Paper text:
The present study focuses on the ancestor [name] from the hyperthermophilic archaeon [name]. Biochemical and structural studies showed that [name] is made of a SmsC2B2 heterotetratmer wherein the [name] subunit hosts both ATP and [Fe-S] cluster binding sites. With respect to the six components of the SUF system, [name] has only two components, [name] and SmsB, encoded by the smsCB operon. The [name] subunit, consisting of a RecA-like domain and a helical domain, contains all the structural motifs of the nucleotide-binding (NBD) subunits of the ABC ATPases (i.e., Walker A, Walker B, ABC signature, D-, Q-, and H-loops).
Since attempts to crystallize a [Fe-S] cluster-bound protein complex either in the absence or in the presence of AMP-PNP were unsuccessful, we used cryo-EM to determine its structure. The reconstituted SmsC2B2 complex prepared for crystallization in anoxic conditions, was rapidly vitrified for cryo-EM single particle analysis, and the structure determined reached a global resolution of 2.64 Å. The protein complex prepared in these experimental conditions revealed that the C-terminal residues C218, C239, and C242 of one [name] subunit coordinate a [4Fe-4S] cluster. These three cysteine residues bind the cluster in a solvent-exposed hydrophobic pocket consisting of residues P40, L216, I223, Y235, and P247. Although the SmsC2B2 complex could in principle contain two such binding sites at the [name] head-to-tail dimer interfaces, the two [name] subunits form a strong asymmetric dimer with a single populated [Fe-S] cluster binding site. All residues coordinating the cluster and forming the hydrophobic pocket are in a single [name] chain. In contrast with the unoccupied [name] subunit (apo-[name]), the [Fe-S] cluster-bound [name] displays a folded C-terminal α-helix composed of residues 227–241 and a short terminal loop. This region comprises the two-cysteine motif (-C239-G240-K241-C242-) coordinating the [Fe-S] cluster, and P247 closing the hydrophobic pocket. Additionally, residues of the C-terminal region extend the dimeric interface between the apo-[name] and [Fe-S] bound [name] subunit, in the vicinity of the cluster binding site. This interface consists of a cation–π interaction between the side chains of the K128 in apo-[name] and the Y243 in [Fe-S] bound [name], as well as the side chain-backbone intermolecular hydrogen bonds from the N131 in apo-[name] and the K236 in [Fe-S] bound [name].
Numbering used by the authors:
A (entry chain C): 4 to 237
B (entry chain D), C (entry chain B): 28 to 316
D (entry chain A): 4 to 247
The structure:
C-alpha cells in the first residue's frame, strides 16, 4: 500500500488560496523532491500534511497508511510514524544537546543506554560535528546557525521515521560541497525511510527517484528529474 | 573542619573559624548576633557555611549579621534552610556587608520546604563596594510550598566594580511572592546584571520590582526577566531604569504568560503530548534538570 | 474642500460636513463643545481636518469632544497646532471616542512651536472598542521648544479588536515631558502594540509610564522604548505588565542612554568621525533626514 | 610597494588565543579568497585589519600602502582607502535607502548630483533589485535578510575603495546560482579595486586569482585556485575534528 495520498486539497490563509486542487502521492522507500518558484505554496503543503496550527483543509482529503488524518492532532500524526524538520529551528534555554537527541528516538535503539549513546556518536560524526566538543553544550542562542541546523539533522537519524519532510535541508549550513548532504540521504534510504524534500537546488533534485513541479498552488508536471527540471528551466 | 555558623531550635549550636578569617556569634535582646572578618590579602580554597533547621511548632528566629572583607581578599558563602514541618514559623535576617579594594565576595542561599503552607521568610541586606570589588548573589526556592516570601536588597558601588544577582522560584496552591531590589552605579566603569526566572500555578500571586540607577561615566547595566503562568494564577512586574550621564547605557527585556508556540509544536512533532512538552520547557528555565 | 473644524485665539471660526457624516461645534461656559458622528456602513476616502492657532499672549483653550462610529464604518482625522511667538499659552482637550462593530478609526496630531518657552499642552482621552474594531493613534512634538507636556490615555477593548499607539518627541533647554497610558484587553483574540521614540539635551527631564493588562484567552501585547541622552538631561522609564489568564502572552524591551556601538562603527567605516556619525543617528530617531 | 602586508599576527579574545602568527599579502588589482571551517580565524582577521573595537594584536604588524597602521582609528583607516562589509549588517531607525547609499560615495561621483543620482540606480540594477520601489524604504527591521544584504553590496559599488573586505558575501540571500555575485566581483576589478573575500563555498573561490586555507588560527595551504580547491573537497569535506 502507498504511504501518502493528497487528494483535491484546497487551503486559504486569510482572504485567499495558497493551495488549490492539489493531487500528490509518495511510495515506500522513495526519495521525492518538490520544486517551483517562491510563493507557489511549497512550505504551506509541509505545514498542512504535518498539521501545524493555523493550516486546515477547506476541501479535499489526506490519507496516510490507508487511514484518514484530518481528525488527528500533531501528537497523533507523529505516533503513526510521520515527522517534520523546520527551515530555521527553535532554541531552548537550559536543555543539553545529549538530552535533546533522546526525545523521540526509535523503539529499536531507545531500549538500552549503550546502544543509544553509540547511535548519538554515529549521528554527530555523520554530520561532521565532534561529539566530545558538543554533547555537554546547551541547545540555546550560544550555538551558531550552522551548528544548530546540523544538530536537527542528527535528530532525524535517531528517530528513523517512515516519512520525513525537509524544508530546505541545505539552507543555513556552512557546506564544503553538496556531497555532505547526499551522504545523509543515502544513509536514510538504506534503512527503508521515504523522503519528501523541498529544495531550490538542481544539484539535490538530480539525486531524487522522482521530481514534481508546483506553481501558483497547482501541480504542473512530475516524473523523471531529467525531464521536469529542464522543462522548468524555460 | 571548616569555617561555619550553625543554628537549630533558635539556638547557636556551633561557630568555628580558620587561619586568616575570624567568626563570632551570641544571643542578645531576642536576636542572634554574628560576625565574619577576613584579614588583608587572604584567599581561600573553599566556601564558608551557614546552617538553619526547624523540626517543631510555633518557632520564630531573628538574625543580625555583619561581614567585613579587607584589601585584595576573597571568600564564598553557602547558606542552607530546611523546614520539613510548616506549622506557623518565622525566619527573619538582617545583613551588613563591606568589601574593600580589589576584594571578591559570593553568596548562595537554598530552601527546602514540606507540604504545609504557614511559613514566612524575610531576608534584608545592605552592601558597600570599594574600588575594583566583585559581588555575586543567588537565591533558590523551587521545592515544597513557599508560603509567604518577601526579599529586599540595596547596593552602592565605587569605580571598576562588578555586580550580578539571580533569583529562582516555583509557586503552587495559595503561595505569595514579593521581591524588591535596587542598584546605584556611582563610580566610573561599574557594571551589573539582574536576572529572574519562575513559574506560577493554582491560586498563587507574584509581584516583582527591579531598579538600576546609572549616575557616572562608562557605567553599564542589563535587566532580564521571564515568568510562566498556569491555572488561575496572577503575575505583576515593574522594572525601572534611570540614567543621568552622557556616557552611560542601560537595557531591559521581558516575557510573561504562556510558553512559546513554536517551542511547543517542535516537541509535539517528536511524539510528546502537550503536558509532557510544557513541563520540559519549565524545568529548563528554572534550572531543575 | 471637505469636512473640517477651525479654532483661532480660543474662538470657533468654521465647521462643515459631507453626506453620511455629522459635525457639531459651539461655545458654552467659556469652553468649546464639539461632536462627530458617522452612520452605519459609510467608509470615507479622506481625513477630517481640525486646526488650532495662537499668535497672542495669556490665551487659554479648553475643548470637550465626542466621537461616534456606527457599524461597518471607517474614518480618520488630522490635528494641526501652530503656536508662533507663543508665551503664557494653555492648551487642554478632553476626548470621548466609541468604536462600533467591525468599525475603524485613526488619529494624528502634530505641533509647531517657537523658542519663547512659556507653553502647557494637556490632552486627556478615553476610548471604548466593540467586537472586531480597529484603533490607531500618533502624537509628534519635534520642532521648537516643548515647554511642559502631559499625556493621559485609557483604552478598553472587546473580542477580535486591534490597537496601535505611537509617541515621538525632541526635548531641549529646560523642557519637561510626562507620558501615562493604559490598555485593558477584556475579550478573546484582542491585541496591541505601544511605541515611544526620542532624544533629550541640556537641562531637560523626561518620565514615561506604560501599562498593559491581559485578562482574556489568546490576548497578545508588545511594548518597545528607545531614548537618546546628551549633555546633562535626565531620563526615567517605568513599563508595567499584568497577566490574569492561562492563554495570554505579553512582552517588552527598552534601551536608554548613548547611541548603539555597532551603528556608530558602521558609519565610521564609511569615512565619518564620532560627531558626524552621532548626529546622523539622532536625526533618524526624531524623524529628520 | 604592496597594497597590504600582514606580518606574524597574533590575536586574543579574553583568555583565548584565536590567530597564531598569520602572514598575508595582497597585490594591486587582485582578488584573493580565504576559505576554511567557520570560527577558526576567518572573521576575526577581517575585524583586526579594519580596527573594530575589542580586536587588537598582542604581537605582529599590519602595513597598508607602506605605512604601519597600529596607532590609527577606524575613521583614519577609512580616509586612506580601506572598507568592511559585515556578515549581518546593522538596522537604523528612520534612515531611508536613498540617504544611506549617498553617505560613503566616492569623491569622483559626489561633485555632481546627476552623476550621484545615476550611480545609485546603476548600483541597484547590478544587484537585481528594482530601483523605484526600494529608494524610499527605510533601512530598518521591516526588510528581509536577503534585501538588507543586497543593499550593502550596492554601497561597496558606490564607495569604490582601493581595498574592499567582504565577510560571507552571499550569506542571508536565497539564490539558485552564484553568477549574480561573480558579475559584481568582475565589475569591481574592471574599475581597478582589490578584493579580500572570506567564504565557505568553492564556487566563489574558483573565480579568484589566489586562494589561501586557514585552519585552527594558521595558514595550511596557499596558491592556485584549482590545486587548493581539490584538497578542500577531498580532505575537509569528510573531516569532523577541524584541527590538524
Ligand atoms: S582536513 Fe586539515 S585543514 Fe581541512 S578542516 Fe581538517 S584539519 Fe583543517
Amino acid at each position: 500500500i502507498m504511504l501518502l495520498k493528497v487528494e483535491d486539497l484546497h487551503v486559504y490563509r486569510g482572504n485567499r488560496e495558497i493551495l488549490k486542487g492539489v493531487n500528490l502521492t509518495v511510495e515506500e522507500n522513495e526519495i521525492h523532491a518538490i520544486i517551483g518558484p517562491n510563493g507557489a505554496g511549497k512550505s504551506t503543503l509541509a505545514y498542512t500534511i504535518m498539521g501545524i496550527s493555523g493550516y486546515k483543509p477547506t476541501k479535499g482529503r489526506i490519507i496516510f497508511k490507508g487511514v484518514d488524518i484530518i481528525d488527528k492532532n500533531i501528537t497523533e500524526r507523529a505516533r503513526m510514524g510521520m515527522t517534520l524538520a523546520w527551515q530555521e529551528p527553535a532554541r531552548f534555554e537550559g536543555i543539553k544537546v545529549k538530552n535533546y537527541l533522546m526525545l523521540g528516538m526509535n523503539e529499536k535503539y531507545k531500549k538500552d543506554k549503550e546502544i543509544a549513546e553509540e547511535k548519538i556518536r554515529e549521528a554527530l560524526k555523520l554530520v561532521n560535528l565532534d561529539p566530545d566538543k558538543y554533547l555537554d553544550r546547551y541547545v540555546d542562542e550560544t550555538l551558531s546557525g550552522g551548528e544548530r541546523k546540523r544538530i536537527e539533522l542528527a535528530s532525524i537519524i535517531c528517530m528513523e521515521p517512515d516519512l520525513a519532510i525537509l524544508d530546505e535541508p541545505d539552507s543555513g549550513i556552512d557546506i564544503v560541497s553538496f556531497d555532505e548532504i547526499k551522504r545523509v540521504f543515502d544513509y536514510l534510504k538504506d534503512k527503508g525511510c521515504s523522503l519528501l524534500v523541498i529544495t531550490h537546488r538542481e544539484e539535490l533534485a538530480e539525486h531524487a527517484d522522482r521530481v514534481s513541479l508546483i506553481c501558483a498552488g497547482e501541480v504542473i508536471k512530475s516524473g523523471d528529474p531529467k525531464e521536469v527540471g529542464e522543462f522548468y528551466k524555460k | 573542619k571548616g569555617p561555619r555558623i550553625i543554628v537549630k531550635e533558635s539556638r547557636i549550636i556551633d561557630v568555628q573559624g580558620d587561619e586568616g578569617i575570624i567568626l563570632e556569634g551570641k544571643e542578645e535582646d531576642g536576636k542572634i548576633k554574628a560576625k565574619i572578618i577576613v584579614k588583608k590579602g587572604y584567599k581561600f580554597k573553599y566556601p564558608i557555611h551557614m546552617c538553619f533547621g526547624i523540626t517543631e511548632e510555633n518557632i520564630s528566629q531573628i538574625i543580625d549579621v555583619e561581614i567585613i572583607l579587607e584589601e585584595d581578599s576573597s571568600i564564598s558563602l553557602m547558606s542552607h534552610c530546611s523546614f520539613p514541618k510548616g506549622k506557623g514559623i518565622k525566619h527573619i535576617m538582617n545583613g551588613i556587608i563591606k568589601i574593600g579594594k580589589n576584594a571578591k565576595f559570593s553568596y548562595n542561599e537554598f530552601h527546602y520546604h514540606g507540604m504545609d503552607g504557614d511559613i514566612l521568610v524575610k531576608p534584608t541586606v545592605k552592601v558597600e563596594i570599594d574600588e575594583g570589588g566583585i559581588y555575586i548573589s543567588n537565591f533558590t526556592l523551587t521545592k515544597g510550598r513557599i508560603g509567604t516570601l518577601d526579599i529586599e536588597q540595596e547596593i552602592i558601588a565605587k569605580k571598576d566594580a562588578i555586580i550580578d544577582i539571580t533569583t529562582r522560584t516555583y509557586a503552587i496552591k495559595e503561595d505569595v511572592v514579593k521581591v524588591n531590589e535596587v542598584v546605584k552605579l556611582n563610580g566610573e566603569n561599574a557594571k551589573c546584571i539582574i536576572k529572574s526566572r519562575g513559574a506560577a500555578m493554582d491560586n498563587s500571586k507574584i509581584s516583582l520590582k527591579l531598579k538600576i540607577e546609572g549616575n557616572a561615566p562608562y557605567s553599564k547595566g542589563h535587566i532580564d526577566c521571564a515568568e510562566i503562568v498556569k491555572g488561575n494564577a496572577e503575575v505583576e512586574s515593574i522594572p525601572i531604569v534611570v540614567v543621568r550621564d552622557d556616557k552611560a547605557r542601560i537595557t531591559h527585556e521581558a516575557a510573561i504568560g504562556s510558553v512559546d508556540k513554536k517551542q511547543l509544536e517542535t516537541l509535539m512533532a517528536k511524539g510528546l503530548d502537550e503536558d509532557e512538552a510544557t513541563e520540559i520547557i519549565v524545568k529548563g528555565m528554572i534550572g531543575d534538570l
